[PDB]
């Protein structure tokens, strides 16, 4: 269950997610999952990044959920669960700003 996952922050806004992620103590890959503000049924993965050009910054990725069952950021790479998707992205950066590392502090 998603609401049981420590990285699921539920109904929090984009600005709130950025407020939580823009903490200097957060290494790259700090993240959380929240409801999509615009697509019913979808979610968003907010991830902290850091580079010399931009400094500490946040990126937001839309996670689609199919009625057919698949969860994915890109339709080419789908998962049977949100947990599996998180697990996979904690190991592969792929198109993400950084692989997922630790859950964002509240
Ligand atoms: C969630 O809040 C959400 C997010 C988005 C997309 C987001 N836009 C905004 C307005 O927040 C956005 O544009 N994010 C970027 C992230 C940076 C990369 C560029 N792209 C395109 C993209 C996305 C993902 C990949 C990828 C990732 C992993 C594996 C393979 C490929 C490549 C390219 C972005 O999307 C929209 C809406 C919402 C919402 O809350 O509703």
Curated annotation (Swiss-Prot):
Q: Where is the SH2 domain?
A: 7-104
Q: How is it modified after translation?
A: The phosphorylated form is termed pp60c-src.
Annotated localization: Cell membrane; Mitochondrion inner membrane; Nucleus; Cytoplasm, Cytoskeleton
Tell me which residues bear Phosphotyrosine: 43
Kindly state the tissue distribution recorded for this protein.
Expressed ubiquitously. Expressed in the skin (at protein level). Platelets, neurons and osteoclasts express 5-fold to 200-fold higher levels than most other tissues.
Spell out the subunit comment.
Part of a complex comprised of PTPRA, BCAR1, BCAR3 (via SH2 domain) and SRC; the formation of the complex is dependent on integrin mediated-tyrosine phosphorylation of PTPRA. Interacts with DDEF1/ASAP1; via the SH3 domain. Interacts with CCPG1. Identified in a complex containing FGFR4, NCAM1, CDH2, PLCG1, FRS2, SRC, SHC1, GAP43 and CTTN. Interacts with ERBB2, STAT1 and PNN. Interacts with DDR1, DDR2 and DAB2. Interacts with CDCP1, TGFB1I1 and TOM1L2. Interacts with the cytoplasmic domain of MUC1, phosphorylates it and increases binding of MUC1 with beta-catenin.
Task performed by this protein: Non-receptor protein tyrosine kinase which is activated following engagement of many different classes of cellular receptors including immune response receptors, integrins and other adhesion receptors, receptor protein tyrosine kinases, G protein-coupled receptors as well as cytokine receptors. Participates in signaling pathways that control a diverse spectrum of biological activities including gene transcription, immune response, cell adhesion, cell cycle progression, apoptosis, migration, and transformation.
UniProt note: domains: The SH2 and SH3 domains are important for the intramolecular and intermolecular interactions that regulate catalytic activity, localization, and substrate recruitment.
Q: Which disease is it linked to?
A: SRC kinase activity has been shown to be increased in several tumor tissues and tumor cell lines such as colon carcinoma cells.
Task: Supply any other comment.
Answer: May be involved in blister formation in Pemphigus vulgaris, phosphorylated-SRC is abundant at blister sites but not in normally adherent tissue, which corresponds with loss and disruption of CDH1 in cells adjacent to blisters. Phosphorylated SRC is increasingly abundant at pre-lesional sites of blister formation and occurs prior to changes in abundance of CDH1 and DSG3.
The UniProt entry's sequence similarity note says:
Belongs to the protein kinase superfamily. Tyr protein kinase family. SRC subfamily.
**Record protein name field:** Proto-oncogene tyrosine-protein kinase Src
Q: Which organism is it from?
A: Homo sapiens
Species classification:
Eukaryota, Metazoa, Chordata, Craniata, Vertebrata
């Amino acid at each position: 269950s998603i609401q049981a996952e420590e990285w699921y922050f539920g109904k929090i806004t984009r600005r709130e997610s950025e407020r939580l992620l823009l903490n200097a103590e957060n290494p790259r890959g700090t993240f959380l999952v929240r409801e999509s503000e615009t697509t019913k049924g979808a979610y968003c993965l907010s991830v902290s990044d850091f580079d010399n050009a931009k400094g500490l910054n946040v990126k937001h990725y839309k996670i689609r959920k199919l009625d057919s069952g698949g969860f994915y950021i890109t339709s080419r790479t789908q998962f049977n669960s949100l947990q599996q998707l998180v697990a996979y992205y904690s190991k592969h950066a792929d198109g993400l700003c950084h692989r997922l590392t630790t859950v964002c502090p509240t």
